[PDB]
Amino acid sequence: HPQLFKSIGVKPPKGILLYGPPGSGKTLIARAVANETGAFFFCINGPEIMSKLAGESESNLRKAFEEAEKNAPSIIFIDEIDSIAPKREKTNGEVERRIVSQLLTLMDGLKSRAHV
Amino acid sequence: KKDFSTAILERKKSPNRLVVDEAINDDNSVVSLHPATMEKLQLFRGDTILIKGKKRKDTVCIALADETCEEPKIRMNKVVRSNLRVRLGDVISVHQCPDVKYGKRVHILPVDDTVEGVTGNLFDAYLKPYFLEAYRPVRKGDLFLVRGGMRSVEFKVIETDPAEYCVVAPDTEIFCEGEPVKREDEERLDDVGYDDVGGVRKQMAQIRELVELPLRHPQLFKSIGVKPPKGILLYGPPGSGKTLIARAVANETGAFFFCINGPEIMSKLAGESESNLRKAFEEAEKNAPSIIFIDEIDSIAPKREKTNGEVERRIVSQLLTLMDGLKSRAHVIVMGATNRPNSIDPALRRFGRFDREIDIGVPDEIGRLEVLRIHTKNMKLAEDVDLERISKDTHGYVGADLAALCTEAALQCIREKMDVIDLEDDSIDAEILNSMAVTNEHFHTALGNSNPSALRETVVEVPNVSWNDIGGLENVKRELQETVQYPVEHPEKFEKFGMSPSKGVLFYGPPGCGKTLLAKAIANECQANFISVKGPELLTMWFGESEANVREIFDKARQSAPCVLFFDELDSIATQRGGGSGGDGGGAADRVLNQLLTEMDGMNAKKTVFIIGATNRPDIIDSALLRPGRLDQLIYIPLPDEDSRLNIFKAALRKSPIAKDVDIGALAKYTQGFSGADITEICQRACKYAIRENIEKDIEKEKRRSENPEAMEEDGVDEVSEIKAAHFEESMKYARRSVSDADIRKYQAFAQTLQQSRGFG
Amino acid sequence: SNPSALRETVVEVPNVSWNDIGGLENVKRELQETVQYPVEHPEKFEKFGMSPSKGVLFYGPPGCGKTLLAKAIANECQANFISVKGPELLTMWFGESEANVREIFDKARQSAPCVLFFDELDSIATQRGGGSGGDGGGAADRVLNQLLTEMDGMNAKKTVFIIGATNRPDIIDSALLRPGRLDQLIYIPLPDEDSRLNIFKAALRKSPIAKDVDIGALAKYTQGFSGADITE
Amino acid sequence: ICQRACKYAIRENIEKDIEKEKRRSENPEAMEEDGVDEVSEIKAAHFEESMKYARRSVSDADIRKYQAFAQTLQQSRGFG
Ligand SMILES: Nc1ncnc2c1ncn2[C@@H]1O[C@H](COP(=O)(O)OP(=O)(O)NP(=O)(O)O)[C@@H](O)[C@H]1O
Ligand SMILES: Nc1ncnc2c1ncn2[C@@H]1O[C@H](COP(=O)(O)OP(=O)(O)NP(=O)(O)O)[C@@H](O)[C@H]1O
Ligand SMILES: Nc1ncnc2c1ncn2[C@@H]1O[C@H](COP(=O)(O)OP(=O)(O)O)[C@@H](O)[C@H]1O
Ligand SMILES: Nc1ncnc2c1ncn2[C@@H]1O[C@H](COP(=O)(O)OP(=O)(O)O)[C@@H](O)[C@H]1O
Ligand SMILES: [Mg+2]
Ligand SMILES: [Mg+2]
């Protein structure tokens, strides 16, 4: 129902961060919402993206974002952001910095909405 | 004289610019002036004039005359004003167009939102009848509204021949050329202008003086002979409006823009960033004048110690080498946004590189009100939104948090109306989908449902606490005035005697008497920026950030002169250096004390930045802080007496109703030597007893009325409910003083120890 | 089987009501008019102008009915009750460390309204005297200052109440008694003859009692006994 | 003491200046008379006012302590 937000004039939020104890139902809640709302759900696992070779991880993330923006409406359930985007107290891994910056750039370029 | 620190923003009066307001005539190409305006401008009947508005927008309109119009107003209708991106009460320039040049290969196409369910043909019923031989001036891109019946069809002028502007003559051969322009054209709603940045009127003034003047007036700088600065480095709390200010000042000036991003460059693989930066700079230089906004510059040039990465070092070196090469003087201005001035690699702070630094701090009360009024110009507000109280309630909210608050308020307003709307489909009724106006209750709910983001930030403020609501202490007030205001307000007269006043005061006395109140009041009266720093904050931030705060506090106090820096609770750190001290905590306390002593020996050398400290027990204070300079001046804050107690009682009860039989003088005589804050606690306890009595009475009356429904509304209504003598009698009997006679005797003993001048009476 | 998240924080509404305690009638009235009214009837105070006080320090003999009082007031207010003891802060100072205390207040801020409770303050609120400071064993230098800094920011929030308890009112530092940080002080006394009668009735409410036992005789016998001793 | 006298003198100077300005403002018919601001030197009244508040930075025991610490190094006094 985008009509309400068109009439009252507010941009709906475009990001949710579920956090809680490990094994408490976060993935289940996300999957239930995706299946109940009938949207084109898309899953990006943490270690799965982080386990691939250099250069391939950015390609996978870019492909996933483009595919989600291709079949609007869509959802991109990034899983375990702790693994792929850790807190940067001190790190030197070039692949880690590249993947974090790629995620930031894609997230900030997502502002063209199209129900993502 | 005038304050010229913000001398660029204000307009200059001219007989060529007028004010915009409403009119009567409703033709798409007419505006009604007063004949005196035409006489002053040497304009006549039927002339087609050019109107120039905000964000470099302009149009052509036919100017007619009427006596009802006022000379300083233009009487602009709604459609043209919408095309000019202005509102009533703004300034619009006027000129004359010599070349009408009726168009030949014009193009006129409609808009999607008005052709939905269109009645049918628009060529022979909407376009030709009202624009053939109409001689209406037309400018490319104008969204003009026409009616060929009940339906109003907006039209966008895709193309004209001549391209800029023309007149719709019968020579125009175009029909409704099929394609309706979608609303996406207004999706890029002319990006950001200047009215979309509000709350900061000095930082924007500095940015304008550094950017818009070099790129639009090289004559002044060439005449004076000064080399204008290139590097600019915005910084402030995250989400406070840095990128927005940069876009506002770069899009309004009309210069070539180039928005480099931090992670965007960093995301690319090694060996490409070094090429991307060089290509970006070489492209920007080629299109003088040029602005290069490098967002999140802290990501691509971090502190070298904090990275120890080869690729990071290489990209930093490439950036430095490129930046030093901007001396071509080809009007290339670099603006590197960040949020921590201490986290940037210091090699970028040298001369030639980023050297001007501007702090986009958190907005104040008027700033928050202005941000709210800017953001709520689209929501369907109700007729009871009181934004002044909303702005006053919110403290520590940066602009982004205020935008989130407005969005949350609208979401709450939608949620409150969830009873009627279904879930399978929507659009149950236009009227039901209408109304739903956001009232004050939604704003209160959203304010209670949200959190700030700048509570820990040092709020360099200008307190509103005046001399009043303190009471008594006339001698201390006058001594503080002579110590503070005169060296700031009249610095030239002290040169006549050549005796430079000191730059420190110490406040010692019983715990709680208005020690911070006097400092805040004098800062308010001098209108100097006030900074409140406490001992616990420094002690915890030492372990938080490895003592990278104490120098920063003095730097932020020095960059805002005049300033009355205030240290509260020196008793934690400023204790004398005992011989039995030990441990990490004592070491940290002594390190903080020594760092403070080192900084005060340079901040009190010059620059006239005032320092006032307050301590609860003076004899335990280290004797280093009483040497000449630093905190030499000593002031004792006494316990208030009967007259002062009456004054403070009146100040406390000024904001609350009081019964006329409560002899406040009898309360003053009732108390003796109380600790200032205990009087406020007595007032609060009286208020609590009064509230309990009033709520009990109301609940009993409601229960009585519910028990007997037939008892209609009697004359009994809630009165003023003044705090009567019973409340004070019940409260004062629970009084518990905070300072025993031993503490005041110790303070008096110390005061007399210092006051060796007792024999000079 | 054993839980995997037993060490997680506690956010709940305790089931203890006024009837679970007895003898503290005046303290019941005072706590009601200090906690319940400022949240459930807020606009009256701005009607009178002066703002209420946020924070209450209980002091009394060990085991005399302090924690039960906080539970009861949280139940009456129907606000989330977050309980953080003394040693937990010290052991987290070497776990999550510096940010840990902040996190607690954040979970107090996001779960408004709340009644944050600090028991065993004597372990951390030792006075900042001449012998204060010390190494990592002297947490009174770090956690006390961090707690003061965090507590000075809660004044802005309308309803996040702070309650502390301590058995050693003498050793408590003086920075926790200035207005803005635990302004009010309440003395929780040892239950007296009527109070001991009520507490014995409350303790034995859950179990059958023989017909030959007189509660009054036990109450007169047990004069000077705290609540924990009656329960024992 | 000298700085206190200077500050009191500047207080007197600003008070006199504002008094003259108010007198001129009242009945603005009063033109620019010959009462121009004088040298405004520090007067004996200012010094006497300041003297009544000056403290004493050295007690009666520290002087004797320093004298003893010096005298223990001056043990040739008995043979001088
Ligand atoms: N709140 C819940 N309601 C119903 N089933 C649940 C709930 N939480 C967990 N489960 C079930 O428990 C199992 C594991 O939960 P799952 O949602 O897969 O873990 P998770 O919380 O996603 N793990 P983590 O990534 O550590 O947060 C599944 O079979 C779920 O159906
Ligand atoms: N002073 C301001 N005036 C008007 N709008 C503002 C102001 N400050 C922030 N905003 C609003 O804040 C929203 C987003 O803030 P923005 O200025 O984009 O964040 P930022 O501070 O640039 N982020 P970063 O570069 O990550 O520090 C926009 O919708 C702006 O309208
Ligand atoms: N004479 C007074 N006039 C106005 N307010 C007072 C006075 N004395 C005490 N107070 C009140 O007492 C409170 C604390 O007093 P203060 O002197 O700030 O204590 P401290 O010196 O410990 O900071 C203030 O909020 C103030 O409103
Ligand atoms: N008024 C009371 N009614 C019932 N039990 C009480 C009462 N006061 C204390 N108790 C008993 O005291 C115990 C809890 O004491 P607590 O409040 O934790 O004291 P402390 O905080 O000193 O440990 C409970 O087991 C309870 O049975
Ligand atoms: Mg999971
Ligand atoms: Mg930015």
XYZ file of C-alpha atoms and ligand atoms in Angstrom, chain C residues 20-22 62-68 119 167 199 202 227-228 231, ligand 4:
44
model
C 4.008 -9.416 49.196
C 5.437 -6.906 51.713
C 4.120 -5.510 54.967
C 20.913 -5.953 55.378
C 17.824 -7.937 54.465
C 14.964 -5.623 55.408
C 12.795 -5.456 52.274
C 14.555 -3.297 49.697
C 14.573 -5.390 46.507
C 10.954 -6.446 47.044
C 22.039 -3.216 44.325
C 23.797 -1.314 53.165
C 5.901 -10.383 57.415
C 3.207 -13.130 54.303
C 13.079 -10.063 57.181
C 15.632 -12.605 55.981
C 12.089 -16.208 56.132
N 7.919 -6.785 54.002
C 8.323 -8.040 53.691
N 7.426 -9.012 53.427
C 7.813 -10.262 53.116
N 9.096 -10.651 53.044
C 10.104 -9.781 53.287
C 9.757 -8.394 53.627
N 10.916 -7.743 53.817
C 11.916 -8.633 53.611
N 11.439 -9.845 53.288
C 12.288 -11.031 53.014
O 13.607 -10.581 52.703
C 14.147 -11.297 51.592
C 14.744 -10.330 50.581
O 15.543 -9.353 51.240
P 16.201 -8.171 50.374
O 15.148 -7.121 50.133
O 16.915 -8.812 49.209
O 17.297 -7.558 51.376
P 18.784 -7.237 50.855
O 18.555 -6.303 49.693
O 19.468 -6.604 52.041
O 19.337 -8.584 50.459
C 13.017 -12.087 50.959
O 13.317 -13.485 50.985
C 11.793 -11.804 51.803
O 11.189 -13.032 52.218
